[PDB]
Design a binder for this molecule. Structure first.
Ligand SMILES: Nc1nc(-n2ccnc2)c2nc(-c3cccnc3)sc2n1
Ligand SMILES: [Mg+2]
Length: 201
């Protein structure tokens, strides 16, 4: 797959110290929904197995079939590597700017995406960068209840430590609530057994 280079050279796509930047890529997407005026709340969850889950009540990642590839948008998004999200020379390094949940995919033993759209609950799954589960309807919900959950398990062999840095995570989420006044951002640490909420009028 086109995600192959990311797994050969993870350091050229992410910070391989710890999986935090993976987390920040998913959060950025949910906060983009808030910025356009579609999500009001972003819930983040550090699970006890050191996986991260990021839920927003936005429109839902798009699930329409692109005709030329005959696959749902959400899959294109998760599988397509974007160029120029991170770059380097021996004097200068940049990242990321206006990147990709696809690097999260490439560097995860599992990813699960759930999308609430039009009263349907859609599900797609990935393992080691490869699709293990086709987009499918696994439940129903209210027509008003829309948005996206991304749940991912970082592959520890790509990082110096598989552990999320709690203080780096929490500052990011605080920073995002400041950037988007009125959005509610929550963090639930199933490890340290804490609950946190930020909202700025
Ligand atoms: N969390 C999230 N992330 C999205 N995304 C887009 C690209 N990478 C992540 C996203 N896209 C949405 C969308 C995109 C186009 C049309 N309608 C909705 S809602 C959404 N919600
Ligand atoms: Mg700050």
């Amino acid at each position: 797959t086109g995600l192959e280079p990311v797994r050969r050279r993870p350091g050229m796509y992410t910070d391989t110290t710890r999986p935090n930047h993976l987390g920040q890529e998913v959060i950025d997407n949910s906060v983009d929904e808030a910025l356009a005026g579609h999500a009001k709340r972003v819930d983040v969850i550090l699970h006890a197995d050191q996986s991260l889950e990021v839920i927003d009540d936005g429109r839902g990642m798009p699930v329409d079939i692109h005709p030329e590839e005959g696959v749902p948008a959400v899959e294109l998004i998760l599988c397509r590597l974007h160029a120029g999200g991170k770059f380097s020379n021996k004097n200068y390094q940049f990242s990321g700017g206006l990147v990709g949940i696809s690097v999260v995919n490439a560097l995860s033993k599992r990813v699960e995406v759930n999308v609430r759209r039009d009263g349907q609950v859609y599900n797609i799954a990935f393992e080691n960068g490869e699709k293990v589960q086709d987009l499918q309807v696994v439940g129903t919900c209210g027509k008003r209840n829309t948005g996206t959950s991304v749940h991912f398990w970082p592959d520890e062999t790509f990082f110096d430590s598989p552990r999320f840095s709690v203080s780096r995570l929490t500052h990011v989420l605080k920073a995002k609530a400041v950037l988007c006044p009125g959005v509610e951002i929550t963090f639930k640490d199933e490890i340290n057994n804490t609950e946190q909420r930020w909202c700025y009028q």
